[model samples]
Target: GSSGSSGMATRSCVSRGSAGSAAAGPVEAAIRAKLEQALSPEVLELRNESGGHAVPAGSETHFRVAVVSSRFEGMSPLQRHRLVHEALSEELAGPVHALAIQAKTPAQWRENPQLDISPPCLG
Candidate 1:
């Protein structure tokens, strides 16, 4: 099949979000690794927000994660949360305290690529 005629196209806009980040602690690293393995996200962001809560400075207790992936294409809100929680079941069962999550499709994430940080925890 030696033909000089070819039609191939790749519709890659490539929103190209932020890659990785600095490691704050061991649990943060574990969370990122597990989620990356489980979700295979286009964007995987983790915020060790324990400082904002009633915890020691630089504690890897509370966290907020934003996961954008095609794997969430047909999944519902609860299903998405469940998947993430399931991935980090070991951590949640141990030292990890609170985990806030926002799961999105790649397209949905494009609408608001920036990670939102709300007010600090109220105590």
Candidate 2:
């Protein structure tokens, strides 16, 4: 389950480099680009939570996404999730095994920016 307050955080656990694409790992970079293009979010937090799971350990296979955008103004929570899933379709189909999403409008986030942090997976 999820734990704390505000922003994107990987409850499973815990990178740096150049500019542009060179700065992050392939998976993280791809997700970032997709979200930016589709949401134009005011706040976007992307975290890799693979460590907490039974996966290989190093690859960015699990993730948590917290996004605040005007695009979500009238959309239901489910709708917002659909949009995010659509944006990251390729990743979801391949390397990304799990994703926890928190999608909200800017006004909603301002009222309560804190999000639930996930617990380590049992599997």
Candidate 3:
């Protein structure tokens, strides 16, 4: 969880970095690359919610990702979540410690365009 770890947060929690590849950071790059290729998202927003955690500086251990794509048009929330999860399997396997995802169809995304300000950082 970007805010607290009480509900769905797993204590810790991107490619969310390439396809954006080596252009920025590593984990986040891979996250970025993978999501772009797999989801073809219309809107992709990634927030690296790491600093406030107990980890040392430069931690990529947490992330909040919001993806809007037509591919999620008829998909269930979990289904949409799985798609994003699968796309970042490589990262989640190790690099990412905690991940809170917002998976939505383009229209659904527009209804609430901004990423949810996760509960307060309670890690």
Count clashing residue pairs per candidate: 0, 5, 21
TM-score of every model?
Answer: 0.69, 0.67, 0.68
lDDT per residue, candidate 3, 27-118, as tens digits? 77668667988777988877666656576545677787878888888878788777877878767778887777777878978787867746
- Weakest 10 consecutive residues of candidate 1 by summed lDDT: 15-24
lDDT of 2 by residue, 27-118 (tens): 77678778988888988887666557464546666778888898888878788888888888888788776778778889989999876656
Instruction: Tell me the lDDT of model 2 at 109.
Output: 93
- The runs of at least 3 residues in candidate 1 whose Cα sits more than 4 Å from the true structure, single-residue gaps closed, are 1-23, 118-123
Q: Which lDDT tens digits does candidate 1 get at residues 1-123?
A: 677978667687564444334655667777888898988899998866654546445466678888989878988888888888888887777867667787888998898888775575568
Best by TM-score: 1
Candidate 3 Cα deviation (angstroms), residue 41: 1.0
In model 3, how large is the Cα lDDT of residue 78? 80
Q: Could you tell which candidate, 1 or 2, scores higher by TM-score?
A: 1
